[PDB]
Ligand binder design. Structure first.
Ligand SMILES: *CCC(=O)N[C@@H]1CN(c2nc(Nc3cn(C)nc3OC)c3ncn(C)c3n2)C[C@H]1F
Length: 280
């Protein structure tokens, strides 16, 4: 996997897919000069650093090559930065589970848990802390295959850095580990906490965590030992994996490699672990 530098004439925006503080993402078409191959892509136009700085960050990003991380294919530098990425035709997993809640079986849910853990383990191998894992930031390539994506919060740790120490950026409190809320500290193990919340989202078919509760109250609820409730479809075995992800001691939490093993075992006999009517 290598970074391609695109000229504006190489790609076209077709329609908007979504928008946020990061910028806007479009469905588009990329035709590399004289290659005659038409590639469906997502184009993320970000809302300055030197061009070489941006290209360097894009090079590292483009080297992230794993079946369960959405890949940067190329970049175009003009008045704006435009990132050309793999298109995930089914959109964010949050909306997908909300839409198809009555037609999603245990096999798909547990498989997604495995896949997200595989992608996160790869990011950890690359020394990348994601810092924004949530169902909204997982994308659906096919119903059978999902990929993690990133909107600017991910950080590369230095050879001797064990944690990332954040500053004033806005934070997704309800997905964060307690140590991140209290001390602005982020690690692969705080990503594990977020992974647990992400799994809870999937198992509740996209429900809102700590629904209706002010973000300002969350740290106090967590300090009292309270956590997100057991989803209706979850046997206690699955809920206990979530609860392990939210233990106060970061080193008490499972690592992604362990999560891959545990969810993979469950995915072999999915109906023993999730209880879904009509499944199957
Ligand atoms: C739930 C989060 C959300 O809606 N985020 C938006 C969508 N984003 C995004 N979307 C796609 N693909 C997509 C979405 N829809 C409705 N249709 C499609 O494709 C036909 C995508 N592919 C790759 N990347 C990076 C994507 N991002 C991100 C936010 F804009």
């Amino acid at each position: 996997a290598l970074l391609r530098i695109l000229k504006e004439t190489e790609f076209k925006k077709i329609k908007v897919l979504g928008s946020g503080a990061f910028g806007t993402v479009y469905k588009g078409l990329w035709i590399p000069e004289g290659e005659k191959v038409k590639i469906p892509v997502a184009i993320k136009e970000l809302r300055p650093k030197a061009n070489k700085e941006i290209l360097d960050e894009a090079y590292v990003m483009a080297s992230v090559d794993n079946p369960h991380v959405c890949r940067l294919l190329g970049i175009c530098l003009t008045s704006t930065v435009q990132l050309i990425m793999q298109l995930m035709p089914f959109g964010c997993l949050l909306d997908y589970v909300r839409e198809h809640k009555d037609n999603i079986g245990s096999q798909y849910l547990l498989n997604w848990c495995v896949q997200i853990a595989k992608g996160m383990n790869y990011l950890e191998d690359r020394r990348l802390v994601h810092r924004d894992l949530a169902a909204r930031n997982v994308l659906v390539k096919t119903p059978q295959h999902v990929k993690i994506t990133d909107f600017g919060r991910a950080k590369l740790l230095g050879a001797e850095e064990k944690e990332y120490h954040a500053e004033g950026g806005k934070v997704p409190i309800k997905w964060m580990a307690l140590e991140s809320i209290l001390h602005r500290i982020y690690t692969h193990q705080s990503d594990v906490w977020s992974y647990g919340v992400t799994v809870w989202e999937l198992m509740t078919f996209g429900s809102k965590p700590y629904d209706g509760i002010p973000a300002s109250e969350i740290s106090s609820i967590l300090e009292k030992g309270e956590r997100l409730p057991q989803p209706p479809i979850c046997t206690i075995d699955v809920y206990m994996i979530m609860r392990k992800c939210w233990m106060i001691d970061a080193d008490s939490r499972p690592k992604f490699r362990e999560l891959i093993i545990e969810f993979s075992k469950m995915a072999r006999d999915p109906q023993r672990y999730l209880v879904i009517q009509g499944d199957e």
